[PDB]
Amino acid sequence: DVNYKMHFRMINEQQVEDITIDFFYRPHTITLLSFTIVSLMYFAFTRDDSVPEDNIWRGILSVIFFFLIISVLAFPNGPFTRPHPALWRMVFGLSVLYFLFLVFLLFLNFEQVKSLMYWLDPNLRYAERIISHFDIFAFGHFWGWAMKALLIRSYGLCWTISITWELTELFFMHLLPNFAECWWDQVILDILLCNGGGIWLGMVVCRFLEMRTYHWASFKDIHTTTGKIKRAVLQFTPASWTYVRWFDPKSSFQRVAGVYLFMIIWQLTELNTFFLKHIFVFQASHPLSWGRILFIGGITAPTVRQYYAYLTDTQCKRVGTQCWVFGVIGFLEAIVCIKFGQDLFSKTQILYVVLWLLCVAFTTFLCLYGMIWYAEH
Amino acid sequence: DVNYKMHFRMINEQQVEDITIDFFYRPHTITLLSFTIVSLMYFAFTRDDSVPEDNIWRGILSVIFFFLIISVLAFPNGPFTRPHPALWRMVFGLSVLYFLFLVFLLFLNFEQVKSLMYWLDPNLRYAERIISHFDIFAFGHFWGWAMKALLIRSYGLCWTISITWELTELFFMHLLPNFAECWWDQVILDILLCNGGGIWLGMVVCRFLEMRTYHWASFKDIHTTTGKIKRAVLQFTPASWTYVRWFDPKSSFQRVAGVYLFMIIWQLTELNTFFLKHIFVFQASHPLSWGRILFIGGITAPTVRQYYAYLTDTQCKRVGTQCWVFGVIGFLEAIVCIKFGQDLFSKTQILYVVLWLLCVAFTTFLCLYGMIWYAEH
Numbered sequence: 001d002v003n004y005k006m007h008f009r010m011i012n013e014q015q016v017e018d019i020t021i022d023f024f025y026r027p028h029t030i031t032l033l034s035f036t037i038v039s040l041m042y043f044a045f046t047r048d049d050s051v052p053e054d055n056i057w058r059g060i061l062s063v064i065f066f067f068l069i070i071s072v073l074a075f076p077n078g079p080f081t082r083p084h085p086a087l088w089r090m091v092f093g094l095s096v097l098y099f100l101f102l103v104f105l106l107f108l109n110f111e112q113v114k115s116l117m118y119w120l121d122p123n124l125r126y127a128e129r130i131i132s133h134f135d136i137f138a139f140g141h142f143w144g145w146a147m148k149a150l151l152i153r154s155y156g157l158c159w160t161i162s163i164t165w166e167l168t169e170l171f172f173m174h175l176l177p178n179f180a181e182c183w184w185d186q187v188i189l190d191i192l193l194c195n196g197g198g199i200w201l202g203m204v205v206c207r208f209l210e211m212r213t214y215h216w217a218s219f220k221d222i223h224t225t226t227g228k229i230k231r232a233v234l235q236f237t238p239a240s241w242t243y244v245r246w247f248d249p250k251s252s253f254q255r256v257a258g259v260y261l262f263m264i265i266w267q268l269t270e271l272n273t274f275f276l277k278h279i280f281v282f283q284a285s286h287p288l289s290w291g292r293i294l295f296i297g298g299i300t301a302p303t304v305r306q307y308y309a310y311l312t313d314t315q316c317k318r319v320g321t322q323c324w325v326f327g328v329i330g331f332l333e334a335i336v337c338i339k340f341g342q343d344l345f346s347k348t349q350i351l352y353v354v355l356w357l358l359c360v361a362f363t364t365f366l367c368l369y370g371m372i373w374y375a376e377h
Numbered sequence: 378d379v380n381y382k383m384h385f386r387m388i389n390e391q392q393v394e395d396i397t398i399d400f401f402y403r404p405h406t407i408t409l410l411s412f413t414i415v416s417l418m419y420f421a422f423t424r425d426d427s428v429p430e431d432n433i434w435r436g437i438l439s440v441i442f443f444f445l446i447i448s449v450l451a452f453p454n455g456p457f458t459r460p461h462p463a464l465w466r467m468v469f470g471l472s473v474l475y476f477l478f479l480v481f482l483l484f485l486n487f488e489q490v491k492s493l494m495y496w497l498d499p500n501l502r503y504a505e506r507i508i509s510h511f512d513i514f515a516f517g518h519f520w521g522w523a524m525k526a527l528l529i530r531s532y533g534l535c536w537t538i539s540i541t542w543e544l545t546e547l548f549f550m551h552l553l554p555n556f557a558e559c560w561w562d563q564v565i566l567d568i569l570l571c572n573g574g575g576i577w578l579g580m581v582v583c584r585f586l587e588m589r590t591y592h593w594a595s596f597k598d599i600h601t602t603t604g605k606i607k608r609a610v611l612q613f614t615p616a617s618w619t620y621v622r623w624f625d626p627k628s629s630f631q632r633v634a635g636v637y638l639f640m641i642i643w644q645l646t647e648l649n650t651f652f653l654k655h656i657f658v659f660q661a662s663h664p665l666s667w668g669r670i671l672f673i674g675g676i677t678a679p680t681v682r683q684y685y686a687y688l689t690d691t692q693c694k695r696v697g698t699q700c701w702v703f704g705v706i707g708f709l710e711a712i713v714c715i716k717f718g719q720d721l722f723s724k725t726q727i728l729y730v731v732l733w734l735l736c737v738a739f740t741t742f743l744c745l746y747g748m749i750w751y752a753e754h
């Protein structure tokens with residue numbers, strides 16, 4: 001029983017090792033208490049508040065900012081400790097804010113959510129060929145799949161969802177009877193170039209990061225100018241890497257069905273992004289579109305590393321809180337999409353979605369046959 | 378360095394001892410996730426949302442409830458572990474919610490706060506002798522002072538702050554030139570009877586609880602129904618008691634300054650309770666008054682214990698997060714009172730307030746002389 005509480009404190013709050021510069025790791029939480037009061041003392045007695053709209057906006061920014069200070073003090077930092085554990089406490093603190101925002105949205109009607117997002121941006125109310133198909137949003141697909149394949153560490157898992165989703169996104173063409181988007185982009189250029197190339201780069205890098213010896217010197221010990229610039233930059237790369245193996249030659253039916261739930265919460269999060277963009281109409285260049293994808297992408301890095309630990313390690317006995325909060329966010333967005341988007345469909349095709357998981361299990365099972373038959377042969 | 382992190386975890390998250398009924402202490406957080414998702418599914422797909430005000434109110438309620446759940450998952454439980462640590466995690470979560478609400482209020486103007494509190498309760502817009510002076514609010518004063526004296530374990534501190542604050546509240550009579558309240562109440566009945574009796578009862582109970590042997594049996598081991606009822610009721614009393622001694626015969630000036638800061642924040646909280654009520658006009662029977670007083674009294678106990686631990690224990694080296702949040706809440710309430718209440722005073726008497734701390738240091742210094750001279754004599 002000592003192991004459970006000890007093993008959970010590696011998933012939830014990984015601790016720093018070989019602390020040599022103790023300035024960055026020694027809490028000063030009365031210089032934080034004094035800074036918060038003197039900051040708010042300046043924003044109270046000097047800031048003009050004759051504009052009612054600006055008071056509400058600046059109030060939100062301060063509530064969000066001072067919830068990140070609470071996150072640094074109290075929230076767990078996941079399984080990550082670079083560049084600093086406090087970044088991953090503030091990354092977790094934003095997950096709780098987004099989770100509670102989705103809880104609130106579930107009780108408002110459609111007109112109140114539409115009016116809420118016409119307050120964030122008033123403009124929302126009024127709203128050879130290969131080269132053009134690559135743009136700043138192609139880097140989002142490429143570098144998103146490069147990051148995902150880094151922590152999934154499986155060609156089969158990544159290509160099963162890079163293929164099935166881009167087939168699903170092409171099937172959802174009756175939602176879009178206006179834009180003349182050609183099918184070749186979703187099946188050829190996305191699967192092969194953005195997703196296919198991005199997966200390879202994240203798998204080439206991950207292979208490097210697991211054959212790398214992590215002997216970390218101390219920033220004080222180095223006595224060359226180029227050496228300190230080298231060690232400061234490398235503080236933003238992983239300290240170590242865990243060898244990820246999802247299946248085994250003898251994998252329990254609980255392990256097969258834990259990987260299968262992974263490929264369904266994962267493949268649901270690609271369905272929330274598609275629908276949240278269609279129900280609440282905003283373009284891909286709006287900060288609500290790419291800002292949320294960056295945030296969900298940032299939550300994914302410690303969620304994949306906490307789901308893997310719980311799924312495989314036999315002494316964990318608890319799922320980390322960041323993996324918990326990602327679970328509700330992925331599921332609450334679906335309810336928001338179902339509740340608000342009840343008019344964009346007339347004949348609902350959930351048969352495709354029902355067919356969408358049958359061909360995912362049938363393909364995970366082909367991954368099991370691939371591994372088991374390869375070990376013997 | 379090992380002791381600091383170990384000693385802080387005895388103040389931030391005290392762990393349970395002699396767990397015999399493991400049902401109450403084994404996390405089931407995927408069941409929590411499923412319950413949250415199904416509850417929100419029901420509230421989304423069955424609740425009528427044609428009334429916007431009801432939508433906003435129920436959204437606030439649900440956000441608070443699920444922040445309580447998040448605090449059960451992630452927030453620390455202070456130095457207390459009875460009846461369950463989760464109650465104190467939820468208490469800390471409510472502390473954080475109130476602190477963020479105070480952060481938000483500092484940017485709104487007076488009219489926006491008035492409109493907000495009229496939204497909370499629309500009625501706010503339209504708003505022999507000894508026996509009558511005793512009511513349920515007298516009971517509130519009595520039991521609050523009983524709890525305070527229980528956690529401070531000092532006649533000197535409690536009586537000093539009681540006398541000083543009642544004198545201050547009597548002095549603040551130019552704020553109230555309409556109600557015909559006299560000095561008799563505040564100087565006699567609110568010192569000798571209510572506060573005096575509460576302090577005496579709290580000190581008697583603390584003396585009992587620090588001479589009590591806490592041999593806790595197991596609810597399963599007892600084989601008499603009366604015994605099981607007895608052990609179930611006693612789960613809501615402290616498991617142990619700490620002998621509290623603020624001063625010493627040889628007390629460092631740091632200890633004297635820490636006790637002085639403790640007393641100053643205590644009297645500041647009393648001032649906040651007075652000024653919030655007189656600025657934002659709500660009567661003493663409104664939930665905004667007594668609910669806030671109950672909430673602050675609930676925050677006070679782990680705050681007092683953690684402040685004592687940090688002040689006296691030499692290996693703590695960090696102040697618990699609940700104490701941090703309590704201090705920031707008190708200071709933010711003071712800032713709110715200063716910012717919004719700038720019209721209820723014309724000639725500001727801070728000389729009395731300046732005189733209010735000089736006579737607290739003098740009275741603390743008489744406590745030091747009392748202890749030191751008593752030990753030799």
Ligand SMILES: CCCCCCCC/C=C/CCCCCCCC(=O)O[C@H](COC(=O)CCCCCCCCCCCCCCC)COP(=O)([O-])OCC[N+](C)(C)C
Binds near residue numbers: 315357
């Ligand atoms: C409606 C239309 C049609 C659609 C239908 C579709 C639905 C079809 C049905 C799908 C159901 C399939 C699941 C079946 C049960 C699986 C049991 C299982 O293996 O349990 C466990 C793992 O699984 C878990 O339960 C883990 C925690 C999950 C909850 C947190 C969510 C975080 C999400 C993060 C997602 C990240 C995404 C990243 C994105 C890139 C392991 O089993 P165990 O033996 O208990 O564990 C042993 C290990 N310990 C306990 C010893 C440590």
Ligand SMILES: CCCCCCCC/C=C/CCCCCCCC(=O)O[C@H](COC(=O)CCCCCCCCCCCCCCC)COP(=O)([O-])OCC[N+](C)(C)C
Binds near residue numbers: 633634638686701
């Ligand atoms: C304007 C008009 C006139 C008005 C003027 C008035 C203003 C006049 C000026 C008043 C200020 C008086 C000087 C204060 C000096 C303090 C030095 C000191 O002793 O430090 C420390 C304690 O003190 C602290 O700093 C503790 C943490 C405080 C912050 C938490 C807030 C929550 C409090 C919750 C209050 C609860 C209330 C409950 C109510 C019932 C101890 O010193 P150290 O050696 O560092 O500690 C050794 C111990 N370790 C470190 C080894 C572990």
Ligand SMILES: CCCCCC(=O)OC[C@H](COP(=O)(O)OC[C@H](N)C(=O)O)OC(=O)CCCCC
Binds near residue numbers: 016017217218231235
């Ligand atoms: C701005 C700082 C630039 C980087 C300067 C630099 O040298 O940083 C060193 C520190 C940690 O220094 P150590 O080598 O003792 O850490 C040992 C290490 N944990 C290990 O695993 O060996 O990193 C940070 O906290 C950086 C916080 C950045 C927050 C943005």
Ligand SMILES: CCCCCC(=O)OC[C@H](COP(=O)(O)OC[C@H](N)C(=O)O)OC(=O)CCCCC
Binds near residue numbers: 147238301
């Ligand atoms: C602001 C810039 C932040 C940039 C932060 C960055 O690049 O490194 C942060 C973490 C470092 O993780 P640790 O070395 O603490 O743990 C290591 C743990 N055992 C593991 O298995 O990784 O790496 C990842 O997220 C890896 C995915 C990369 C995601 C880009």
Ligand SMILES: CCCCCC(=O)OC[C@H](COP(=O)(O)OC[C@H](N)C(=O)O)OC(=O)CCCCC
Binds near residue numbers: 395399460595608616
């Ligand atoms: C409703 C339950 C009635 C009480 C029934 C009862 O017998 O209590 C069960 C447990 C007692 O736990 P142990 O007896 O193993 O000791 C525990 C600890 N190690 C000690 O020895 O102190 O208490 C709770 O968690 C009660 C949670 C109440 C939450 C409201």
Ligand SMILES: CCCCCC(=O)OC[C@H](COP(=O)(O)OC[C@H](N)C(=O)O)OC(=O)CCCCC
Binds near residue numbers: 457460
């Ligand atoms: C819902 C009803 C909750 C009622 C809860 C209750 O009465 O007990 C809760 C705590 C129990 O404290 P522990 O035994 O965990 O720690 C013991 C620690 N070493 C100490 O010093 O106390 O007691 C106090 O708050 C004591 C003040 C009383 C405040 C009323």
Ligand SMILES: CCCCCCCCCCCCCC
Binds near residue numbers: 091291294295
């Ligand atoms: C893991 C990092 C998460 C960061 C969240 C991204 C939010 C950015 C919002 C930017 C809005 C700018 C408007 C012009």
Ligand SMILES: CCCCCCCCCCCCCC
Binds near residue numbers: 668669671672674676
């Ligand atoms: C330590 C416990 C804190 C509980 C907070 C008290 C809030 C109660 C509000 C009740 C409102 C009822 C309106 C009729």
Ligand SMILES: CCCCCCCCCCCC
Binds near residue numbers: 513662667
């Ligand atoms: C422990 C009891 C908490 C609730 C106190 C209710 C006070 C009601 C006051 C009504 C006066 C008219």
Ligand SMILES: [Ca+2]
Binds near residue numbers: 190
């Ligand atoms: Ca696509």
Ligand SMILES: [Ca+2]
Binds near residue numbers: 546567
């Ligand atoms: Ca009084």
